[PDB]
Amino acid sequence: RKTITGVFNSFDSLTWTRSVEYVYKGPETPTWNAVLGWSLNSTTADPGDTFTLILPCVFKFITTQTSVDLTADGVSYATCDFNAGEEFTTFSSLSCTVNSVSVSYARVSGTVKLPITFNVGGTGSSVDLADSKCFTAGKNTVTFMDGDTKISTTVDFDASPVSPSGYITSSRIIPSLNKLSSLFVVPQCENGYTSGIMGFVASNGATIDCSNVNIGISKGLNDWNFPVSSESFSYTKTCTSTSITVEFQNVPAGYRPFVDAYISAENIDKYTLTYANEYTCENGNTVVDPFTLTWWGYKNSEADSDGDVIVV
């Protein structure tokens, strides 16, 4: 019947372990494991009571589980459903319910390990542009919220090692949609662009979702080479289920044109894109520099928990 708060009472550790090939270590890279302390007291929580944990700047959980239980010695005290932020919200959450149990307990406390990745940008969507300012390279405090209470720990987030001068690409699985977002940022022209053509063509096995496309110019890029703004400029979009192409005219100095689209793949863990990549800098000659990338999925992990019950 009631909402309780403060069930998640500590943020114990935040540790990265590689779950994908190729990608540098950074906030978005699968997988970060957050270990949190949790406690339930039967004097202050009844079966059916609900509680929620908010995870700011978290894109998704790196698990196919729909829920995780808060357990101690193989008894389930509560069930928490995963609610990924993805492109809907800037934060993720757990919506939890206290479970009925077959024998009484006085109180129980333990820890829970949650596989997550953080959102620090990746498209021109409102969510990603907001989250592009979530963290900076180096030392950051990561804070989650349970009601009005805050639980935090420190972490070192590495910047992308890829030079911001060249083109930037990124592919991100959006699990609840069985789709990816795929980004292309044009190489830098320091004093602006006269024109260019940006986009990609999908090989058999994947298609472009023309209903979820963002085109913009960003005022620089962040520590992970992602757009931080999306302003308008003169362009023509040509989008088909096989290809997206954007031809554009002048872009000012300090801005970076980019395009992103959703991709539906028959095999979400493998698709190929051939990128157009044409640009003409102001006071420069036209560069034509197509390339191809085959994008490989990451491995999922499971959330789990442990704890100790006091009986009385």
Binding site: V20, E21, Y22, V23, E28, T29, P30, T117, G122, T169, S170, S171, R172, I173, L180, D269, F291, T292, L293, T294, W295, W296, G297, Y298
Partner: peptide
């Protein structure tokens, strides 16, 4: 021509 990973 090159391999890359998803996030």
């Amino acid at each position: 021509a090159k391999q890359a990973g998803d996030v």
